[PDB]
């Protein structure tokens, strides 16, 4: 009947990104104590990662019916409006309703910042992550996100600090490696972008293999950008093809593929991809300006 030992192992499959397992570890604990304060924050995250929009919908809104005192309940419903939305304005409103009900409730500070971090409000997301890193010490996530937010803002030297701190905790985290190559890429260091993206893929692929592709696809899109940038056009195309199998209605991947062709000199075939990308995203600032180069040249045979 002693179950706090579970919430350690289930917490380990969440940091090492083995979600399928962690979830069946928590539903065990959860089958006992649903209002488990230290386990709930975990089983809530795993639904989100797995895309249990269904479970999380029922759960999140229940906790609020019969437990409007525990901050976990607005962390829940907030995490709900974050994975789906786009009631973004709501999320921040619920998650702040948990901080101002127990400011020492770290989990709501990480979800809070994630709400600024998606709307681009870097100053304010940042501040939230630095409050979470105080409330959730030893946890590497808050540090993975301040590092990234630094990278986005040209703090490549402070970005490198928190990436390596987060790596010396959960070194086997594919989302850690990911945002590191992601930042390298922005620095113009395409070469070392290729190596971090590949590494995050072998660990996502063969290792923690289970088709974590849910709520996900990027990685492959990203790799395709690297190889184009590395003039590896031939290897580039390949990665976008697979990003489409994963998300067969993505317009950005169609613009990325048509742009490679135009770098390759295949205009007839490129403009073909530049059409079937405005068919999806009409406001394609880049597909549109490029399509203009392609025709000025058609007027000239």
């Amino acid at each position: 009947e002693n179950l706090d030992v579970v919430v350690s192992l289930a917490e380990r499959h969440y940091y090492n990104c083995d979600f399928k397992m962690c979830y069946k570890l928590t539903s065990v604990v959860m089958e006992k104590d649903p209002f488990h304060a230290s386990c709930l924050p975990v089983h809530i995250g795993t639904l989100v990662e797995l895309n249990k929009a269904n479970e999380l919908f029922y759960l999140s809104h229940k906790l609020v019916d019969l437990y409007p005192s525990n901050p976990v309940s607005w962390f829940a419903v907030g995490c709900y409006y974050l994975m789906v939305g786009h009631k973004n304005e709501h999320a921040r409103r619920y998650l702040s309703k948990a901080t101002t009900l127990e400011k020492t409730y770290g989990p709501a500070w990480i979800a809070y910042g994630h709400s600024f971090a998606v709307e681009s409000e870097h100053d304010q997301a940042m501040a939230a992550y630095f409050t979470a890193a105080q409330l959730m010490k030893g946890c590497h996530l808050p540090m993975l996100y301040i590092g990234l937010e630094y990278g986005l803002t040209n703090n490549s030297k402070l970005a490198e600090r928190f990436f390596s701190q987060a790596l010396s905790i959960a070194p086997e985290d594919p989302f850690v490696m990911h945002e590191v190559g992601v930042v390298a890429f922005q620095n113009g260091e395409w070469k070392t972008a290729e190596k971090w993206f590949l590494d995050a893929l072998e660990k996502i692929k063969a290792i923690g293999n289970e088709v974590t592709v849910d709520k996900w696809e990027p990685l492959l899109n990203n790799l395709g950008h690297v190889c184009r940038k590395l003039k590896k056009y031939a290897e580039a195309l390949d990665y976008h093809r697979q990003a489409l199998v994963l998300i067969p209605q993505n317009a950005s991947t169609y613009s990325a593929i048509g742009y490679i062709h135009s770098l390759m000199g295949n205009f007839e075939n490129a403009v073909d991809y530049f059409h079937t990308a405005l068919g999806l995203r009409r406001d394609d600032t880049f597909s549109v300006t490029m399509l203009g180069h392609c025709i000025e040249m058609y007027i000239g045979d």
Binding site: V48, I110, S252, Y259
Partner: peptide, 26 residues
């Protein structure tokens, strides 16, 4: 414990340089 979708790369306009350098050269 909560994560935000792996940052996805998107095309900037500055990226059109690659195509610029392709003919300017060739």
């Amino acid at each position: 414990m909560l994560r935000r979708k792996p940052t996805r790369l998107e095309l900037k306009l500055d990226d059109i340089e690659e195509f610029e350098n392709i003919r300017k050269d060739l």
